[PDB]
Design a protein around this ligand. Sequence first.
Ligand code: ALF
Ligand SMILES: [Mg+2]
Length: 728
Amino acid sequence: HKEEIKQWRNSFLFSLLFGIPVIILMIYMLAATMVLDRNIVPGLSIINLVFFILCTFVQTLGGRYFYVQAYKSLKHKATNMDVLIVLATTIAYIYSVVILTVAMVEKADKSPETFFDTPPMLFMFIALGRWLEHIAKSKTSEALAKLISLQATEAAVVTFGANQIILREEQVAVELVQRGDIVKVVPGGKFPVDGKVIEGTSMADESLITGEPMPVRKKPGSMVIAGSINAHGTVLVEATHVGSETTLAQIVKLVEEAQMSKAPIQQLADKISGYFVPFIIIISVVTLVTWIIIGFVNFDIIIKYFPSYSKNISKTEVIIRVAFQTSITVLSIACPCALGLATPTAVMVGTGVAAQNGILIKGGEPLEMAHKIKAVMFDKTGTITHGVPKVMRVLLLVKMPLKRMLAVVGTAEASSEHPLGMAVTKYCKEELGTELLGYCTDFQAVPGCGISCKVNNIESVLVQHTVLIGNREWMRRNGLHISTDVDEAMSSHEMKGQTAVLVAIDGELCGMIAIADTVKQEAALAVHTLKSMGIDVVLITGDNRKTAKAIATQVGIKKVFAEVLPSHKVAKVQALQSDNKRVAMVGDGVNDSPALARADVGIAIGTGTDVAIEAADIVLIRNDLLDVVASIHLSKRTVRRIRLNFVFALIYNLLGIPIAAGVFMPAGLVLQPWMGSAAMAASSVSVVLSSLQLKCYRKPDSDRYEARAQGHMKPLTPSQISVHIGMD
Ligand code: ALF
Ligand SMILES: [Mg+2]
């Protein structure tokens, strides 16, 4: 892609260098120049020779890549802008050279009129437009490198066995590791290869596949996923899949396949030129033939509207030459130069607006593509709901203040590393003055079982004796019975997908605390607005079906897909696309990266993983869900403006075609030399300024979206929503 930009820039610069003198010379000639009209030889004038040299240099240098691209397009059996420019400029230059040569041969008193100015202007403007287009198209795709970065570079190979014979611990590159070997994973170290845990117990973070941050208990006989983050101890892994067979390698393969699947999109300029080229050829040929017929039938019109009859040449020569001149004048006038600037400029401007609005759009494709979206897929964790777990409700199970118990639990749970424990501690701190945690505290934890602590610093809490935190099994083994009402409340909490834990003091049940992810404030409104616009909303997630169903009910999404693996997301996106719907994937995780790449438009939350940002084409820096709606609206406006730009690129030149062909000659209007330049000034500017107008866009207020949905919005019922587990 770099070569295209470099060569287009070189062509544009050469066209500038060898055409700016051409344009300035023609402007000076139009303004008034006797010396310029002076002839070295009767056929050729000084001005004509200068124009010939300059245009020859421009076409030889500026037009080289134009010629190559036109030939390549012809190989594809397609007529595009390059073919139009090459054909028209070559015809004009050949005709100018031929007329100059024949005038020199005939030693005519006055040099003929030449069209040497046309090729330089067309080349300059078209090269500028295509260069801007290629600047816009260029994008950086580092998702593959980010995925490779996840994989562990080195692994700890073990020798002999883990029971009673062990000799050495050595370090081997991950690639050299082979199946059947036993490796060691230290706490906080990456999992090198897929395998089974042997003689080790720990906790592994597996956000690569499932996407959630909740730690996963790993015990002997369990399976580990390469790239998962180990902690809580040292583990030994017996390899089962290595290298490409690893799940991370499969995700990389899916991402690269999705990236390669995307095909180039034909620009509207090429589509317009495809029709224009036959049209321009047809009108030129019609003008030539009709002018020849007019000259032959009467020949009085030719004399009246042209001075070439004064020449000593034969009348047939006069009519043929004037017909050719008029046809080629129509050909020159018809060609639009501003066409290349129609789509690119606006695109860039739109991108800038997005940058001002907190939406980072990479390339021009997302802006041209978002308005066609008919379905949007939302991830659950991070996208629809905050990833961090937060406390929802605390209940009291002799009658001591709730804030005191919360402070006591926070002191007991201060050293807890589990996300739920730290969430409980932060909630307690927020509720309390939280000037400082209790100095005196004794802590003991049995993993997956519960925590027992001794706190004798309740005086510190009051200024601002045993604590036990546990689940059902903790109470059952300790002998504490569970009441029917507390059991029902805990079961209701479990049904909603919110984890509940119980606090007891001095062997007596005291309270219960529930923790769950909180749906974003704008999630419900964004979903409702998307549904109102006619875009289907699908909630696809790898989290447990209960929590996914609860979140969908909260945010009012009818279709729920739970326990979805990364490949299943891509499969769903592919199916939706095959349904002729255009799918936008909103994800902020590694598992979502292949879906984002395959999805027509990938929107990545600003706080998402780096790979998710790289794979996605649109990034929400302001991490606001409603922006997804706004991103659509902007796209709409952009495309509309683009279409309008094309009108400004064509209308003026079209108005010239009737004049160039002599339609208005009886009225007394004939094409003038300045017109050919003037339209180009009128068209190109009329395009660029129009694109600049896109800067006036302002985001609609969220209050407007809520007002449009003030009464239409209504919460869903749990029974209505449907839940699907996996692709099968
Ligand atoms: F946050 Al997910 F699958 F639930 F990427
Ligand atoms: Mg996520």
